[PDB]
Amino acid sequence: TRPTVRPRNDVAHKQLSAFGEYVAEILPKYVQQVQVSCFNELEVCIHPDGVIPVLTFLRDHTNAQFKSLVDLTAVDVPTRQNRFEIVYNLLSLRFNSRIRVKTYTDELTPIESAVSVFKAANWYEREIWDMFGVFFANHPDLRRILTDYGFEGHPFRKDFPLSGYVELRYDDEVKRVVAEPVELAQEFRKFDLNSPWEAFPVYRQPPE
């Protein structure tokens, strides 16, 4: 229960918890869950219409100066209609604390841009615009990062093939590089390594 096991830090869990109810007090209007795992990792909801007003508050001291948007990590789950799950990782430097505060959005919901508030999201912007289509409040430019020029796709939508539909090559008489239909050789020979028989009864969503 020790040589392999990583010890559970109850203390920080206690402090983060208590601060968690503290914040739960402070912004009832958007804050929801106050998740607190044994990893010492706190988490909190925000409604997307509540993106900016919460985040600004975060930067300003209460007992945690949530300075430096370290990340706007993003996840797409097709099942939920609110398929997008934008996440604000954060770190109050003065208090050496860390927190994860996320949201959700639909394909045509103009979620608020923290560009005015953090500016670090001038690109967390355009990536998460481009890879997805998560339209953003008001940004100086929504021009694509990463993906090419005429490129139409939105990879990381967890949709359409990992190769994509596009596969460019130089061509002769046109004297120029041209995009072409894929035609993969050998093909990504995907292995379904999923295991029937649950190893974790403690979890397990009920059949209901």
Binding site: Q186, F188, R189, F191
Partner: protein, 176 residues
């Protein structure tokens, strides 16, 4: 626990001052620093005389693949097809089929060095210690096709190097 860099304040003392202005003029330290590069002229140069000399390599070293045999002269491969399940780039392709003798045997083992990333997983993964990431490294080709190896070429590679490969394994086997 932190340390300031620099920060230190230079002396106003007249000896030290006129010395610094003497650096500002007569350059002094440049030559001192300059003098240092001269020290290299007198050192012996570090080039290995390739290819009549070659760089040191540990026995572990990863390189060209080769299938290899039993001491009896049967091929070690049993087509367990887990090395196909591991090759992170999935370079490997295997069609296991029965031998007329009935033994499991690959009919078309093959791998392309174009997609191989030489992580050398398969050297570790194989239960029968069939395939081996051999010592050889120098084998650049005129054409792409010469890279897409059949089981055949790999067997040949296990033929030329088997003394060597088995020798290195003889050096290494305890660690695994």
């Amino acid at each position: 626990t932190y340390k300031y860099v620099n920060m230190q304040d230079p002396e106003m003392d007249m000896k030290s001052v006129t010395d610094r202005a003497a650096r500002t003029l007569l350059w002094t330290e440049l030559f001192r620093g300059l003098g240092m590069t001269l020290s290299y002229l007198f050192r012996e140069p570090a080039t290995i005389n390739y290819p009549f000399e070659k760089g040191p390599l540990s026995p572990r070293f990863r390189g060209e693949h080769a299938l290899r045999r039993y001491p009896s002269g049967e091929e070690r491969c049993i087509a367990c097809k887990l090395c196909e399940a591991i090759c992170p780039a999935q370079a490997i392709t295997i069609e296991a089929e029965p031998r007329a003798d009935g033994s499991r045997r690959t009919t078309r083992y093959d791998i392309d060095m174009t997609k191989c990333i030489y992580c050398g997983f398969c050297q570790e993964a194989c239960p029968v210690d069939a395939i081996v990431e051999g010592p050889n490294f120098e084998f650049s080709t005129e054409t792409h096709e010469e890279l897409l190896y059949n089981k055949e070429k790999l067997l040949n590679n296990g033929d030329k190097w088997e003394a060597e490969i088995a020798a290195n394994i003889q050096a290494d086997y305890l660690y695994r």
